[PDB]
Design a protein around this ligand. Structure first.
Ligand SMILES: *O[C](*)[C@]1(*)[C@](*)(O*)[C@](*)(O*)[C]([N][C@](*)([C])=O*)C(*)(*)(O*)[O@@]1(*)*
Length: 129
């Protein structure tokens, strides 16, 4: 049986997927940020295919290459918006589009996007406690 797992999502240079400012409002974007204990870097990978933080779901704002990612209300989002799959090698795919979560820098406020998979170092996401 698949069980939920809470984890940090660790990307390029060991920075963590982070909701900017720690706010849990709908449509707040995600970025990379130095890893810390804050709740906005704690993600739960669920069996249902959602990835959640602070009670909200990671979603792209659109389904095209270059769409930025954000959090939004889960129950309201359609499966296409909210379903992801994390592969063992680190690819984090947006299931409906086949695009993958991609970082856009390690400096502040570098908003993550979904892009065509190029097996770039910006497209590998590790789990950590
Ligand atoms: O600026 C940016 C930043 C990030 O987002 C982090 O994570 C946070 N923290 C908490 C605690 O939330 C801040 O605020 O912001």
């Amino acid at each position: 049986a698949m069980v939920s797992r809470s984890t940090h999502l660790v990307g390029q240079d060991g920075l963590c997927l982070d909701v900017i400012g720690g706010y849990s409002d709908n449509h707040v974007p995600t970025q990379l940020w130095p890893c810390g204990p804050q709740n906005n870097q704690l993600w739960t990978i669920q069996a249902d295919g959602t990835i959640r933080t602070m009670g909200k779901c990671l979603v792209p704002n659109g389904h095209d290459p270059g769409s930025y990612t954000m959090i939004d209300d889960c129950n309201k989002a359609d499966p296409n918006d909210k379903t992801w799959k994390l592969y063992p090698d680190g690819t984090l795919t947006h299931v409906r589009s086949s695009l993958v979560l991609t970082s856009q820098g390690t400096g502040a406020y570098a908003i993550t996007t979904i892009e065509t998979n190029t097996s770039a170092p910006t497209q590998s996401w590790g789990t950590a406690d």
